[PDB]
Enzyme design. Structure first.
Site, short mmCIF file in Angstrom:
data_model
loop_
_atom_site.label_atom_id
_atom_site.label_comp_id
_atom_site.label_asym_id
_atom_site.label_seq_id
_atom_site.Cartn_x
_atom_site.Cartn_y
_atom_site.Cartn_z
N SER A 1 38.77 32.94 40.24
CA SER A 1 38.28 33.74 41.36
C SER A 1 37.02 33.20 42.07
O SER A 1 36.67 33.69 43.15
CB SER A 1 38.11 35.21 40.89
OG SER A 1 39.45 35.75 40.95
N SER B 1 36.84 41.02 43.63
CA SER B 1 37.76 39.96 43.22
C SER B 1 39.20 40.34 43.55
O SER B 1 40.13 39.94 42.87
CB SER B 1 37.65 39.70 41.72
OG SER B 1 37.83 38.33 41.45
N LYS C 1 29.63 35.29 41.91
CA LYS C 1 31.08 35.47 41.95
C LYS C 1 31.61 34.98 40.61
O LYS C 1 31.35 33.84 40.22
CB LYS C 1 31.72 34.67 43.07
CG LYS C 1 33.24 34.88 43.09
CD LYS C 1 33.57 36.29 43.66
CE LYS C 1 34.99 36.75 43.34
NZ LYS C 1 35.16 37.14 41.91
N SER C 2 32.32 35.85 39.91
CA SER C 2 32.86 35.44 38.62
C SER C 2 34.32 35.04 38.73
O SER C 2 34.95 35.15 39.79
CB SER C 2 32.74 36.58 37.60
OG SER C 2 33.38 37.75 38.08
N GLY C 3 34.85 34.57 37.61
CA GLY C 3 36.24 34.21 37.54
C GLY C 3 36.77 34.36 36.12
O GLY C 3 36.03 34.19 35.13
N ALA C 4 38.04 34.71 36.02
CA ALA C 4 38.71 34.82 34.73
C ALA C 4 40.13 34.33 34.96
O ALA C 4 40.73 34.57 36.02
CB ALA C 4 38.71 36.29 34.22
N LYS D 1 37.06 32.34 45.78
CA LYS D 1 36.99 33.34 46.84
C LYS D 1 35.76 33.23 47.75
O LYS D 1 35.83 33.58 48.92
CB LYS D 1 37.14 34.75 46.25
CG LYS D 1 38.57 34.95 45.73
CD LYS D 1 38.74 36.15 44.85
CE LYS D 1 40.20 36.27 44.42
NZ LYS D 1 40.31 37.13 43.19
N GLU E 1 46.98 33.51 44.67
CA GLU E 1 46.76 34.44 43.57
C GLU E 1 48.13 35.03 43.28
O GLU E 1 48.87 35.36 44.20
CB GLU E 1 45.81 35.56 44.00
CG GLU E 1 44.33 35.16 44.05
CD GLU E 1 43.74 34.88 42.69
OE1 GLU E 1 44.49 34.91 41.69
OE2 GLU E 1 42.51 34.62 42.63
#
Ligand SMILES: O=C(Cc1cccs1)N[C@H](B(O)O)c1cccc(C(=O)O)c1
Ligand SMILES: O=C(Cc1cccs1)N[C@H](B(O)O)c1cccc(C(=O)O)c1
Length: 263
Positions: free
Chosen positions: A45, A105, A209-212, A48, A141
């Protein structure tokens, strides 16, 4: 700082997986600290933010308007779309979509925005056209989170991402107004609480901004600093760990605590 590097190496061992890290001075762009800076990791993510930078570039060029309304159907919805799933009847404006993509997200918001620019290939073109010849988005996505080992699709490196993030937030590629909007969206991030924010002292600024993703992938990009203003960029990625989400979150939060302690 040396102690933060110690923690990054601890994390990599405790998680039994690679951890990528880099810390850049926001003003000079100089690398302050790093670990596996040139190695590839799934962006998840975190892409983004790059996507909304490409959208803002179009706004600056007069090819897009933040107030333009985009309508969509149930057929466009994919997993994890907390905001877009509530607006099938009224649609959402481009700025509302960037806000949902970055702060929540929202996956469908990201896909709709990717459609406005022509898809993953055009986001990669935008990145190449601004000097980033490493970062690449190949899928939409949610498939872009697959994180197959050694697969370079949908990846970046800590150094390329930090450098690109700095360019989008500073300088002249984007207008002052667009740079401010991008960082304001990142400041309002609502879903990265268990990461760097968990170790952030009262009064510090953070725009992130995080991501998984699959196969233990986790990461975060951020502009942060004391006294309510950012002064550094930090990028952290990991992939391949068998660790729980809670443990991966904790390791990132502890790197954050060290970064803050030795600031
Ligand atoms: O939709 C997904 C796929 C997966 C999320 C978790 C396991 S697989 N990831 C996006 B993004 O990283 O592409 C996502 C969705 C919701 C929250 C986050 C996050 O940053 O925690 C990330
Ligand atoms: O198949 C995989 C790929 C993954 C990599 C990172 C999280 S899941 N992992 C399995 B599993 O979580 O069912 C697994 C479980 C325990 C040990 C290993 C290993 O590679 O040693 C691999």
């Amino acid at each position: 700082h040396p102690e933060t590097l110690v923690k990054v190496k601890d994390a990599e061992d405790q998680l039994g997986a690679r951890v990528g890290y880099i810390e850049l001075d926001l003003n000079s762009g100089k690398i302050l600290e790093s670990f596996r800076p040139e190695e590839r990791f799934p962006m998840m993510s975190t892409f983004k933010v790059l996507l909304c930078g490409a959208v803002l570039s179009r706004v600056d060029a007069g090819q897009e308007q933040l107030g333009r309304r985009i309508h969509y159907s149930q057929n466009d919805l994919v997993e994890y779309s907390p905001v877009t799933e509530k607006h099938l009847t009224d649609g959402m404006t481009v700025r509302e979509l960037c806000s949902a993509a970055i702060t929540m997200s929202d996956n469908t918001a990201a896909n709709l925005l990717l459609t406005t620019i022509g898809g993953p290939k055009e986001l990669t073109a935008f990145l190449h056209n601004m000097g980033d010849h490493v970062t690449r988005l190949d899928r939409w996505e949610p498939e872009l989170n697959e994180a197959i080992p050694n697969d370079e699709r949908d990846t970046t490196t800590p150094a390329a991402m930090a450098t690109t993030l700095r360019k989008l937030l500073t300088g002249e590629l984007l207008t002052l107004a667009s740079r401010q909007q991008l960082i304001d969206w990142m400041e309002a991030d609502k879903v990265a609480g268990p990461l760097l924010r968990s170790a952030l002292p009262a009064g510090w600024f953070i725009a992130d901004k995080s991501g998984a993703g699959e196969r233990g992938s986790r990461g975060i990009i951020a502009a942060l600093g004391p006294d309510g203003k950012p002064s550094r960029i930090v990028v952290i990625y990991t992939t391949g760990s068998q660790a729980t989400m809670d443990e991966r979150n904790r390791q990132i939060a502890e790197i954050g605590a060290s970064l803050i302690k030795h600031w």
